[PDB]
Amino acid sequence: DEIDAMALYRAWQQLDNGSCAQIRRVSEPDELRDIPAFYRLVQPFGWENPRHQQALLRMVFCLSAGKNVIRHQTGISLGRALANSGRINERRIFQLIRADRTADMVQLRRLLTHAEPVLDWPLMARMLTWWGKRERQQLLEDFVLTTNKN
Amino acid sequence: DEIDAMALYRAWQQLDNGSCAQIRRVSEPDELRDIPAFYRLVQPFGWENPRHQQALLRMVFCLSAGKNVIRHQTGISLGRALANSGRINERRIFQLIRADRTADMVQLRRLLTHAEPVLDWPLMARMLTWWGKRERQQLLEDFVLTTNKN
Amino acid sequence: YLSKVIIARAWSRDLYQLHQGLWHLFPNDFLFHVEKRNTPEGCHVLLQSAQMPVSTAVATVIKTKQVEFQLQVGVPLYFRLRANPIKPLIKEAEQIAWLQRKLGNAARVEDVHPVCFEGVLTIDAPALIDLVQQGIGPAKSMGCGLLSLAPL
Amino acid sequence: MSNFINIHVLISHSPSCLNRDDMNMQKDAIFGGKRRVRISSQSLKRAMRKSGYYAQNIGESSLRTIHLAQLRDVLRQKLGERFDQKIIDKTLALLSGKSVDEAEKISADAVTPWVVGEIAWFCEQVAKAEADNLDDKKLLKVLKEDIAAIRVNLQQGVDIALSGRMATSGMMTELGKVDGAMSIAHAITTHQVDSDIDGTQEFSSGVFYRYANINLAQLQENLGGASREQALEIATHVVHMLATEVPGAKQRTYAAFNPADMVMVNFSDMPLSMANAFEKAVKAKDGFLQPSIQAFNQYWDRVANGYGLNGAAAQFSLSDVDPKQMPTLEQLKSWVRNNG
Amino acid sequence: MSNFINIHVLISHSPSCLNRDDMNMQKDAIFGGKRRVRISSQSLKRAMRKSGYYAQNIGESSLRTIHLAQLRDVLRQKLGERFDQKIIDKTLALLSGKSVDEAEKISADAVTPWVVGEIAWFCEQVAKAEADNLDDKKLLKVLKEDIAAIRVNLQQGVDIALSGRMATSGMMTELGKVDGAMSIAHAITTHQVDSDIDWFTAVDDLQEQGSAHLGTQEFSSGVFYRYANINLAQLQENLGGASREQALEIATHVVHMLATEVPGAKQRTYAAFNPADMVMVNFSDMPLSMANAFEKAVKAKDGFLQPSIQAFNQYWDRVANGYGLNGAAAQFSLSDVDPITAQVKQMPTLEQLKSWVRNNG
Amino acid sequence: MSNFINIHVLISHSPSCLNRDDMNMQKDAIFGGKRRVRISSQSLKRAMRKSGYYAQNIGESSLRTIHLAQLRDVLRQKLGERFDQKIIDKTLALLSGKSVDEAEKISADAVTPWVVGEIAWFCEQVAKAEADNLDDKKLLKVLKEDIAAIRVNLQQGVDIALSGRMATSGMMTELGKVDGAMSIAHAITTHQVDSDIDWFTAVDDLQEQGSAHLGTQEFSSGVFYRYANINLAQLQENLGGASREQALEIATHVVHMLATEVPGAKQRTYAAFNPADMVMVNFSDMPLSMANAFEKAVKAKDGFLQPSIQAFNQYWDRVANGYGLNGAAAQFSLSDVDPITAQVKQMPTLEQLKSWVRNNGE
């Protein structure tokens, strides 16, 4: 009973300017909970499943980096695409990992905005739902090894 | 040492017309302190202890919407029932959330009058005692969600 | 001495609180009449007293005009006698009659209505002065029995 | 020619135990600046409605009830000689909106004023309905037209045509509901009633101003379409009542000596109260009564002069400070009956 | 010469209750720092619209409905002789933006004011378009071209031209919309008011012991300040290019009502049929409200009326000299105390004031 | 001598609702501990721009659009008489940085203020360059050399010189972007305000058994402090080197509006057409706002107005004496509350105050 990442992606693309903008203003992920357009956007995708909403929050927030910085195409890792941008320095990523919980989602969004990355969205979605020490580590490893391939 | 919400409900139901009506007349919630029938009604329920009385005030003021607009039945939230009415427009609920302190209790009572809502009273009661920080957000969430299933 | 006292709220809610609170003004026999109650500062009160009241932290005193009584028989005076008639007299006739019993002995009443008694009386002078010092009727320590004279 | 008949009355009577409130004080009102003694609109209204003069001059007082049980009993006596009981009960059903008929007590929604005449009329319409097998709703639809008839039946019980009647859950809401034709103010003293302490004497004799307005066309309408004359008759009897009546029957202060303390009536095209003549509290000058009269006169002067009032107007006054003119109250009653 | 006409009215009512809320309380308003009794602009306006004076001197009021089904029934009745039914319906459907298909209930977006004359004129246009078999959008273009005609229809429904119309969905949303020439303020008491409470008893002829009902009602006496402004250029525009004199005509009518009309409630039980004690009218370049004369809540001296007029006049003097306005001004009052420095012509009677406004000062 | 002109205004409105947010609630604001009713700087500005006083005394307001298609249509009419169309189109394209092809809809980066006079002058330049076979970039280099020439076109449209322009895409990005000469603050109430709620009814003439609509509206009476700053050298610069007298002229016109102009909503139903009760103007080296006089929210005594003016005078006394300010100051008031600090010169009429600003504090 997972979250249809691609359907959600398309759903965010289909939003009215009013809502794309309404959600983009948000500073922290929890403020999304003050937005009605949020609840409307997310609810089919399994919001109202407690054990789902933290994930949903993160996914939406990262999309909320806006306007379309996250562009979808074995799969492409977030780490890989972040490196493929070439805009982002390793130190910053390390800092993403070293930061406590809410801070880490915020910082990531800042990175996404700067990188304008080409990922495999549903993959990034998976990584984003299970977000955890391991997932973080993998973000590092993919980043460094990719940035080193280049 | 909580306030036995259902006990209060039945006590309100059991009031003589003179007192039920005498309290119904109140325009703002704090004016409840001028009525003896208020003191009499609240008296078993612990109004004697400060920081019990603000809650008791809000609970009674919401009952005073009268005559029996609050009809009790996982539990059913206030937001839920406000949507289940279908009479109430989202914009009004927004004004309630955005509203400053006394005004917010007033507009709420006005909504209750309009909705003839079917809630789970003690749930809404609790929600009313801690009113409201998350609670505002929480009711928004419930309303939008219930309103969108439809 | 005629004083204008305000009693604080926490110390004027009950009537016995009023009597005690106005008793405590004398660290050194009196009569009191309530002008207005339940203002935010408490009870607004006109106070007739044998001694000069001293301001407490519950009963503030605004001013103290001492008086000496110059009365002439025949002279017309307005009067507010706040008092309480009993044997509780519900009839209007009975109240007015009661008044004109005490005052009938001292000074004839020419007009009156109602309990706070407002009216005009005409004046024996020493008998009346004496009566004002004494107070009139029941509940002299409950706010009743204070007659105030006023010249036309 | 004119539609509104304006009734101004100065009356003098004690201000003591007349109209009491919840807390056993005499009803008061602040205007304008100073506190005044008050007799409520509704208190005047029912004083008149139940008064003797009203019994001898206008008719039976409409009956105002909440308990439809007792009402059903009363009606079964007064009608059971004229109508079939089940039709009476069905009529009270339809008309009242509440289902009928039997229980210990049956309540209506609110206290409702009725006239047994009106009831009887409806009982007859209902009789002809069920006899013709007409559906209730078509009986109602027919009954929409010629409200005028139900209004002649209001010519039976008159206070309803002055005080108005409003019902909610019932047939009459749709069909038999009527807004009164006379507007009445609460009575306020002319003068202050607290003294300020540290000729001009008097207590125990207040001077009150009472104003009533009668909407003639609305009286005719509220009755079956009565001509102006009948309406005018009712009007004069109200001028009388308004000038003379006091709660507790405590005769007006000078009742052994004069019929009214002061009365003035003017036909005009829009209702006009002279209350502002005493917004400055009148100060005592040899009593309240005279300076009050004089205050009323001068205000009436500047108002009529400034707003260009060509009112068909006449007055009964006792004192001599004066700027039409009637020598006795009954003669005034006549002048009203005759429309100037 | 001057475009704005200002109307100031001081009127004193006896104990009464001229505006209730959902709780049957008087309409409070806080100013400046004190409670004031209020009558809402909507109430005053409707008083004037529905008034007999208006019916007499202005013409039909407009009918404000949200119910288009009922409306089409009315228009079908009235205009049925003048136009084909099919055309009447189509005209309503276009103006409304809702489809009027003889269905039991049809509702617009929001309560809207309609004028019979206007719909009539549009019915004419729809008739020509129907005969010429020209499409709706093209009709829309053509009608956009000459807006003034649709405004000339407003002379039949003037209440709209005064207070304006708003639409969200129809062809009129594009075409028939007006902001309104006159601005009116909620009336406020000049002084602080502590309201009295009257306690009802309903006496039941069938129970001899108790009352059948007990009740309460808020009420106060009060000296109220009414203000209103008429934009003349706008009024002329809203009538489809009516003359300054026609505008002034309507303006005098307003002055009269503003000085004369009191809301109907609860007049049958409290009877505050009071005339204005002070009416002042001034022409000016920029609209001006004297409400500030009473921000210091007026204290009773010999009543509230006298010091209210005092406040008003002194403040008028100050504003007039300070902001150096030299516009035509006239004042009619029952009691001055109080005279303004005489750059105000004094009218002994209201009818003369009205004549002064009709002739533009 | 002094570069900043400070304009302080105390103005009291009757019950009204002069600024709504998305929820049609009044615009709240907290200071320093209490809610105050707020009117947005933007509302004030646009109220003054769009005002008739402005149209009479300053000229034309600017044209603010994000829609270049409509703009090119307008410019095509007016300058269509003055220039060739191909030239106009090209001028718009260079300034805009966006491609002006005949297509129904063409949109700029963001809403922008335009002055037709300005565009006309740019059209002259593009005409010269195109005839002379000058390249666009070269043209840009040349126009960069003399900025003032571009700014005198500002004199034709002044609101831009007052509150400024921002550019992101065009040649405008290089040359025509302007700092505001005037900085203005959202006006707030001197006192605490709890908003009133008016409960309305819409009565439907066709239904007897009820109202057609029930609603609520927020509203308040309030005493507002408006503050505004005009930087004088900046204003002169933004106009292309205008004199202090032209500047001061604009400054007084702004004073007048700042005292006289009220936003339009919902004036037709609430009609708070109130004039300023207090107007005070001071010259200074560094700008100063007296809002701190009301950090202690003024408590009503004989109204809010008087103790507010009192508060203002007292604070200004403390500030002026503490920081040793010795700038020219004049105060005009409707109420008899006199100023404490001489020299605050007292003006009996606004026109006298205005003439005093024109003469530079004399």
Side-chain angles (χ1 to χ4, degrees), chain F residues 24 48 59 142 146 160 165 169 214 252 284-285 290 298 330 353:
Chain F
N24 275 315
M48 292 165 63
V142 181
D146 194 359
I160 294 183
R165 179 125 55 69
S169 74
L214 308 181
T252 78
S284 79
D285 290 332
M290 287 289 94
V298 68
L353 175 72

Side-chain angles (χ1 to χ4, degrees), chain C residues 2 35 46 63 65 78-80 90 92 110-114 118-120 148-150 152, chain D residues 14-18 35 37 193-205 250 284:
Chain C
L2 258 197
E35 273 264 21
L46 165 87
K63 39 201 210 294
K65 172 203 165 192
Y78 296 104
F79 74 101
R80 180 196 44 182
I90 77 168
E92 205 173 294
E110 251 77 20
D111 193 342
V112 85
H113 73 254
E118 241 186 352
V120 179
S148 293
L149 261 29
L152 313 201
Chain D
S14 113
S16 64
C17 217
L18 10 169
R35 203 275 240 96
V37 192
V193 244
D194 327 290
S195 348
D196 304 332
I197 68 173
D198 202 21
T200 34
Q201 198 227 104
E202 65 174 333
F203 315 75
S204 124
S205 84
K250 316 212 305 190

